[PDB]
Amino acid sequence: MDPFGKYKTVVSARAADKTILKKCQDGGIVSAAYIYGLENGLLDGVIVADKDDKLQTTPKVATTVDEVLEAAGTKYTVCPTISVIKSAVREYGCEKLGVVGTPCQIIATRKLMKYPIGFRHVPDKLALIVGIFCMENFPYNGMKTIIEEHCGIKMEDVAKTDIGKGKFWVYSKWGDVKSIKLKETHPYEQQSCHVCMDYTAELADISTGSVGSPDGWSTVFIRTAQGEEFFNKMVEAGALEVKPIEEVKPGLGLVEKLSLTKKEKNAKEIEHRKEIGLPVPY
Amino acid sequence: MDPFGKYKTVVSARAADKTILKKCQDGGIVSAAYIYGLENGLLDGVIVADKDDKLQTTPKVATTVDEVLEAAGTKYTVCPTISVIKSAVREYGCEKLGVVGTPCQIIATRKLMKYPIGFRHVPDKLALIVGIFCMENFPYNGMKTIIEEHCGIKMEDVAKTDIGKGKFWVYSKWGDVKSIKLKETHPYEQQSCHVCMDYTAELADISTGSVGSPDGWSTVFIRTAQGEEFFNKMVEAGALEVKPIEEVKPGLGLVEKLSLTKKEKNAKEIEHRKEIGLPVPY
Amino acid sequence: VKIAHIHLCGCTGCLISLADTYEQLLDILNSVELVYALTLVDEKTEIRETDDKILIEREIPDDIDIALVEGSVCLEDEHSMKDVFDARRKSKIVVALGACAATGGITRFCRGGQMSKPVHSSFVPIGDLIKVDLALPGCPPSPEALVNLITAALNGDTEYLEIYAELAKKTEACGCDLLVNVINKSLCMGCGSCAASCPTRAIEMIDGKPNVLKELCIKCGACSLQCPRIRFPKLIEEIE
Amino acid sequence: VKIAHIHLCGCTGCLISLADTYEQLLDILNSVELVYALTLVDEKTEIRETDDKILIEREIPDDIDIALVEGSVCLEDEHSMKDVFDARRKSKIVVALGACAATGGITRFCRGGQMSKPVHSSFVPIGDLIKVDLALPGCPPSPEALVNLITAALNGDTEYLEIYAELAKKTEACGCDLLVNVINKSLCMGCGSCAASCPTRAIEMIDGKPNVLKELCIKCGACSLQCPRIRFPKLIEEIE
Amino acid sequence: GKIVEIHPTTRHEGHTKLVLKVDDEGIVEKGAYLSVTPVRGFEKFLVGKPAEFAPIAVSRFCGICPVAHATSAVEAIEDACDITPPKDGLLLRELCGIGNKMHSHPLHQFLISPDYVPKDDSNEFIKRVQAMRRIGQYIVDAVGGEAIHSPNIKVGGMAKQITESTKAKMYYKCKEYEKLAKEQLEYLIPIFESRTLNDGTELPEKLGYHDFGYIATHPTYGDRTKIDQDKVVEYTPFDVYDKDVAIQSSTTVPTYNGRLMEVGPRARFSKFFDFKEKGAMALHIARAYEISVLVKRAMEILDELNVNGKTMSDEPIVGDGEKLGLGVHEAARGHNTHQAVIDKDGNIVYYNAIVATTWNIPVISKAVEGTHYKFAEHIVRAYDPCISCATH
Amino acid sequence: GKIVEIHPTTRHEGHTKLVLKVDDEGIVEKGAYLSVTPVRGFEKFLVGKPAEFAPIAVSRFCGICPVAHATSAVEAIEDACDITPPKDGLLLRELCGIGNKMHSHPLHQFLISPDYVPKDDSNEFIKRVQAMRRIGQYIVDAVGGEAIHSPNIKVGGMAKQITESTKAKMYYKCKEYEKLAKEQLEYLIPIFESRTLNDGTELPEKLGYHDFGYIATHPTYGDRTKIDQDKVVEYTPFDVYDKDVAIQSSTTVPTYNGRLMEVGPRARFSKFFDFKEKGAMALHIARAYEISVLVKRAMEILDELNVNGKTMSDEPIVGDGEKLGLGVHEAARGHNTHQAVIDKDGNIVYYNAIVATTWNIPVISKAVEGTHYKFAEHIVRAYDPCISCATH
Ligand SMILES: Cc1cc2nc3c(=O)[nH]c(=O)nc-3n(C[C@H](O)[C@H](O)[C@H](O)COP(=O)(O)OP(=O)(O)OC[C@H]3O[C@@H](n4cnc5c(N)ncnc54)[C@H](O)[C@@H]3O)c2cc1C
Ligand SMILES: Cc1cc2nc3c(=O)[nH]c(=O)nc-3n(C[C@H](O)[C@H](O)[C@H](O)COP(=O)(O)OP(=O)(O)OC[C@H]3O[C@@H](n4cnc5c(N)ncnc54)[C@H](O)[C@@H]3O)c2cc1C
Ligand code: NFU
Ligand code: NFU
Ligand code: SF4
Ligand code: SF4
Ligand code: SF4
């Protein structure tokens, strides 16, 4: 079982702008990439996740850095980022689009490009495809129940959530930090994620994540020639701080264990569905 | 193959009320039965066709005797008579409903009664099923072309269309009578009638038509026990004038020749559709 | 024979339609043995008592002859999955009763997200998981069609049930069935019986042809079943 | 190789889509031989003179390698019925180009009665009469999708075309495909790529799930083909 | 010191669970009645769909009372768009709702008959229930279009007008139903008053007591003015059950002014007919008496009905995309609430439903406390619970 | 004394037939041009369907000019419901229709290139045409959502709006299109004026002459007030062809004051730009000159457009079930007419379409008369016919 798919280099990195770091989940790689492209004419639009005061997510095309800043942080709830990909190249008029999405949404983008039936003049305009790691998603009302009725903190007063370290973590604006075992957070997950076998967004230009890298830092896979040229251009400009993933802890060994834990667990779900007669992607 | 299906007797007959004969096509059998049943409580509602000043038909749940008179006569155009059969037993509140229809619409009625999935509390309320002979139907704009463009009569000035004798006949309100070879009418006929194998309405309680009997009279098949009781009740009440089909000309030999002609012609179409892979009822 | 009413993700309306045989429901219930029906009988009660808990469970019995399975299967609820396979295991004849069990019906529109089970978002007809022997479409099927199915099953009228035994293999339904299989195939003659069969009044006869108001269609299957240019077994031609 | 564009009951939009390869249409036409296309070339001209009349016919030539068949077949028109069987007879590979030829498309709603051919009411995809080898959905499929099919057919890229060769055996499409095969089957994760593929904008993402405005769906099939939880061949995982 | 779990409970609609904490003598100390029926999720897949699809869809909450959800839906959409149904359509709608309650109550008396009706009277008791139900379902067929899921119940009124023939048939059948209602009522009220089952078991005098108020807006139909919907708040099952029980509940927990409330026939009979008895037998008694109230109002409507009056408003379904329309209806089980927000194009942008038994479920949890657990299921059935309704 | 039948005619859209009665020298004495394309029947299946489906469905008349029918459909529904599109939506709509005419005219010049363009110039000529069409299709892509079948064209205006960036792009693309148009026009006008094909054969001076008037309501968009739709009467093929030919025609025969009329570029150029030349060559010349008129008006709309101005009206789609709305638009082939009546619920109760080539088919039948039959097809192509359009 391969753990990461194809990639050129694995890196632990972080954004150089302090504004980004104050607003980002981990190392601010997505926001850093989007803002750099926009500011340097590499991109003219980017798909982002806008969040309502109560953490509801709405897809949006972005043409201003402020917009990118207005939407930095992880909402552990389903946001259809690819639903706006055509709108981006039509009315918005983008020709150098940036797209972000969980590994699945990246899979949708790659198929969307190879068989562009309903995507006339879309594929050529995709200028950078950023993938974020993902283990499991949740319906909004499911995450609402965990945070509010299992963790005490009310959604509005939530400021940052994070899974790992053995369980779920909700960080309150006011200052408290609550944790509940990850074993109780299972009943409320999107069950269509139990057939997903991509952890590190193996088909993105650039994949970025939290695990394997310390707090405030992001594990960054560089996969495609396009992602490499973009990633390098940022480094030569000083938009990123870069350390080898070997020199950093916990390191790639953690990504590998979480990735192959997802794959081995969900591959057994796939075989269970096949066994009882339910459809599985092929 | 068999030409008429099941019947108890076959008789040439016509109504005794001559108001009916003023307004009917052939013998006034359908209207006579409807009006008799309504007047004597055997029927509390009858499905009829409300034609338009341009001969556009409309199905209709008739309840009054005079209504039956406004639908008398043949409109050689499709009229969904069965489409009101539920509305007849719900809001209209009928419990002794009379239904008229071409052999195909009678077939639908018999299936409607044997598999009444969508027909809750409907079968037990059908009191008389009257079928009328039929060889071919037409889309309204097809018949509009036959009458207006091949017979040179505006649908408005149309009075009584009829077929037979080898040609389509248009009788004008202003006196003229035009004839065109049936050959010309065939390109305009509804191509779904070419799979129909029922000429004499073989599944009706009572079936009535023009062919076989003389002008002003009608060939009447009495088929079921329900139709026999209704028919006998009319003859003892004097509503019908009755003569044997053997003493009348052209007689049962024409119906037979026409009924089998349809069967051998369309059975070929059915076998042609099976050959090229199109669906055919079974 | 032993019959049982299994209630999955349904509305009980199919059972109520059977109840709408009225006083003849006692002639039906006396010709068979109602061995299970959570709505009607207290079967099959099994008491397991430990030192901390008394577990009074009503389980689906064994040796069922005919199972009237109503409603669809929720793929994310484990008791729904268990009951549908339990019904196939314990029943000789499995009847997909109603459009929900036969073709999904209204539950085809379910997409989850509602409290208090927001992961409940996937509903399938029982045919997508187990083997179905007979299927009755409609929402609900009329009481008369049910009486006819039950009588034909008890009397071994295999000919009458053929059309239903053929439906058991069909797990999808829509008003489009009339277009795809009839109108588009030069078979429609304009009777309108398909319009009279529709429980939601979604079919409208326009110029001698049906017009489906697709937003008012519950994917029940009654119209596709009624149409005589789809199915027309000789059995129908029998009159007396 | 020899390619031909058969136009049945279509709108020439699929041909225009191919034409929207713009100046690359010369590279495409220069890589093959356009042997028949009523819209573009005067083929195959055959003059038949009797003592009464001169008949100048443009007929479908024999030994066609790839037939891009566009539009549906009218069952009540004999020339339409004849051209579809000729396309199969004379062509080695038949490509159902566009939703009309592949799944019926807009023509599924045809019910006839219009002048000056009021009996024209039954339109079927070419797969309902002839064997189809490849099917391109959408209304119209994108110029980029067409180029890939053409390039893959010239280059014998069997793997790429497998998804389209599998579609050829499917003659019915709807926005309900997403419900019946993804949402109802606990496979939808809410990317929204389907909503972006639709040419009529009939899909609308609501709470991370697709909602199909069924009265705007023209049964084109672009969303069913797009959704990556239906078909996802290993080929797609290939990037550098 | 023991837990008693009954699962599933029987002779009501749907799929529930009793989870009781009982002392060493079997007396319930902490009660838990909860729905475990899967959540089909009507309020969530209706968003994005046209308004006229609501009464068709929400009718499928349940096949016993579908008229109550169609009525509440169209009332909520009419309220959201300021549509006024014409006089005679509103009469037919109320009649259709009354005909539906005319089949539910006898049906429920048939469900509970194995506990209360002697085995020798069973056949004749059932025959009288089905004769009544036929009449109630005939009214729903004629007016609503179908007895199970009435498509005539539409936004703007009722789709079809009946005939003077149909009207007179219903009035005559209502006179016969009233005769059956007196026979039924004179037979059941003495049984319910005896507090003894058909096997001789005496039921405790305080069976099913509780401390909660009632909600009832009308005796036969509904009145949105008689409730302040702002004071109605839905809470989560964690706020009423233990955590290991809460995660299994499928319903929400409605409260009025932060308190549980009972709905249903006794709730109606308390507000409108000065019926003050507590306990579970009072519920069976109120439900039995309401049969006479319903059929007598049905004949009063038919007397008032103009068979030729307009039944559909010509107003268009157009909303402002903000107003939260309120639609209430006294279903057979009690105050049934639907809410809807409609945009300018006639599409649902938000939908919500607080069905009757959704109210009564957390009340049943408390009503079973105080008495032995062998009586818990009899307290449940007194509330005529419909669970597919309470879950939707 | 012979009958010449050409079937199918080529290098136009769709499926037709030329049926000519010629004398011994080949001169056409009686001409007949007729569509034999099956009738998909849009005007008849749209009845019963919602109004927003009309611009989606009628767009499928044709894939060359889909915008023209979408435009005409919503104009007819807006007229029937008294909906007024906002200024900037009406400007984008017109821009979308002009973008479509910006690819149709070069596309037609490409189809007729085998007859007029020398073979050595073919590749460069096709490249210049395709460079022009790419700009035209990009305008329809940006504004309409799709080049082929634009879903933004809606009852009320235009669904989406464009960014100043996009607007600035189209304005620059239009200036380059205007360069290509001058190159194209400086090349083809001399060929058309020489009246000789690329093989050297000279064309008769009176080629394609006829005695009929013209119909055009606007130079670039459409104006329903410039035509009296009551004087438009559709007749049957029996009124223009011989009986054995009439049964084959799929189209109707539109007339204005009971007379055939020509539509198209020369019709517009006659009415608005004082172009008075007759014949078939004048038809190719007017079409070529109209390319500059279109692109100039496109840049004139962009200078006038407010990219943030409202594009969709907020009025609801409600009709009175009687008003026969009129929707006219100057398609690339000529005056295009849609009519529709809408009820209160936004649904189609009657629909009718009189497409441009429907007007020209019976005019073409006469225009081929007088000249040899080997020139008949060249007269057909001068009218740029679209047959799937004329049949709908
Ligand atoms: C449901 C979910 C589960 C995840 N699980 C894991 C995990 O198990 N392990 C792990 O290492 N990482 C996981 N991630 C990713 C992780 O939480 C961070 O988003 C990422 O690792 C670091 O982001 P960043 O700081 O580099 O960029 P940032 O500057 O923080 O910006 C984050 C970007 O992500 C986008 N985004 C936010 N929420 C969503 C969403 N729901 N869907 C699509 N896009 C979104 C926003 O548009 C934003 O631009 C998950 C993310 C999601 C949404
Ligand atoms: C399309 C068509 C084709 C026919 N072809 C033949 C034929 O080939 N040979 C033959 O002998 N007879 C044929 N008939 C029947 C014949 O024309 C007479 O209708 C028949 O004799 C019964 O008329 P009557 O005088 O007995 O009844 P009347 O008293 O005249 O009443 C006639 C009844 O026909 C009903 N009706 C009229 N049009 C339709 C319609 N479109 N659909 C359903 N019901 C309708 C009216 O509602 C009315 O109740 C055909 C009828 C139709 C509609
Ligand atoms: N009565 C009732 Fe339903 Ni089946 C419940 N509970 C509601 O409106
Ligand atoms: N241009 C154009 Fe169409 Ni294809 C034609 N003819 C019209 O409205
Ligand atoms: S686990 Fe897979 S399917 Fe679920 S959200 Fe993450 S990437 Fe998508
Ligand atoms: S020929 Fe057959 S199908 Fe056609 S109208 Fe007559 S009975 Fe019906
Ligand atoms: S088919 Fe209809 S009536 Fe039967 S369970 Fe499903 S929703 Fe209820």
Ligand code: SF4
């Ligand atoms: S059209 Fe009516 S009868 Fe047919 S499937 Fe839909 S709801 Fe059922």
Ligand code: SF4
């Ligand atoms: S039932 Fe069948 S034949 Fe009759 S109108 Fe409906 S689709 Fe046509």
Ligand code: SF4
């Ligand atoms: S698929 Fe669409 S674009 Fe292609 S021929 Fe059919 S209607 Fe025209």
Ligand code: SF4
């Ligand atoms: S929903 Fe859209 S993409 Fe899917 S089949 Fe319908 S029209 Fe085509």
Ligand code: SF4
């Ligand atoms: S493309 Fe497939 S997985 Fe993505 S939102 Fe649509 S149906 Fe769901």
Ligand code: FES
């Ligand atoms: S199959 Fe999709 S609307 Fe019927």
Ligand SMILES: [Fe+3]
């Ligand atoms: Fe609720």
Ligand SMILES: [Fe+3]
């Ligand atoms: Fe027309």
